[PDB]
């Protein structure tokens, strides 16, 4: 089974009103499990399963590391600003790190940064080098070639990352592997009969889902408009697909919902 650990960092000059200028959120298999920001100045648990399987030593440790990370990213904003000839203004540094244990058992590792929403640097484990995407990242690559950073990250991506990912998956095996069935609703709108048909799946877990419309059995997908998959507050997911039909063709259309919690695909009509 595919498992992922992601650490997602945003440092910003203009957050803004009432909001923190630095946030770090950790995810396990897409589920938010740790959180830090520059107002709390505390690394904090976000699922019940991580809270139960960690003591204060772990959160004291993560707090110091992320507090130092915050300071590193304060410096980062100032340094990149100079390299880009910028003054003041609205700017962001983004850092993504983590690992995947794939179904075939293989490990993948990520370490990448973006400046003002554009690729800045990426680690290339194959070649074992930091790639600079723009000239403004070449001095960073220089820094990593000298400081002996590359080996310290190999350790992280190939050992620490994966070992803890395996732990975390273990801590919340039941939570991560759970199934929540969607409540599905079909709704039709506009004119004489029944023009636009809506299919909404509410509150499903896990995230993957295929919702499609069938006109007399035929998948009209190049025709379907989808919202993609969006989150609810409680950790479940949401999705809507619409399709345009001639008024009074309502009876011809069927919504098909494929999801891991449904042993047979679910089939819904307009009332």
């Amino acid at each position: 089974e595919l498992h992922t650990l992601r650490y997602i960092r945003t440092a910003m000059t203009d957050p803004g009103p009432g909001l923190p200028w630095f946030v770090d959120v950790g995810y396990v298999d897409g589920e938010l499990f740790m959180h830090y920001n520059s107002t709390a100045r505390r690394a904090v648990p976000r699922t019940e399963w991580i809270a139960a399987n960690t003591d204060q030593q772990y959160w004291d440790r993560e707090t110091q590391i992320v507090q130092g990370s915050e300071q590193i990213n304060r410096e980062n904003l100032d340094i990149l600003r100079r390299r880009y000839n910028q003054t003041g203004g609205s700017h962001t540094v983004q850092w993504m790190s983590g690992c995947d244990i794939l179904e075939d058992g293989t490990i993948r590792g990520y370490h990448q940064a973006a400046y003002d929403g554009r690729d800045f640097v990426a680690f290339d484990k194959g070649t074992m080098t930091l790639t600079a995407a723009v000239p403004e990242a070449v001095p960073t690559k220089r820094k990593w070639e000298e400081g002996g950073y590359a080996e310290g990250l190999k350790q992280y991506l190939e050992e620490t990352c994966v070992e803890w990912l395996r732990r975390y998956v273990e801590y919340g095996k039941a939570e991560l592997g759970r199934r929540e069935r969607p409540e599905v609703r079909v709704w039709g709108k506009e004119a004489d009969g029944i023009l636009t048909l809506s299919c909404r799946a509410h509150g499903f877990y896990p995230r993957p889902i295929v919702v499609s419309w069938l006109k007399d059995g035929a998948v009209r997908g190049q025709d379907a408009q989808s919202g993609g998959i969006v989150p609810n507050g409680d950790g479940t997911y949401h999705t809507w697909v619409t399709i345009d039909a001639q008024p009074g063709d309502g009876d011809k259309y069927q919504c098909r919902v494929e999801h891991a919690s449904l042993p047979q695909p679910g089939l819904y009509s307009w009332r």
């Binding site: 770090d24 993560e62 590391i65 590193i72 980062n76 950073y149």
Partner: peptide, 10 residues
């Protein structure tokens, strides 16, 4: 766990 801070320095 997260990584050593230094590894986020540009």
């Amino acid at each position: 766990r997260e990584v050593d801070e230094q590894l986020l320095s540009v």
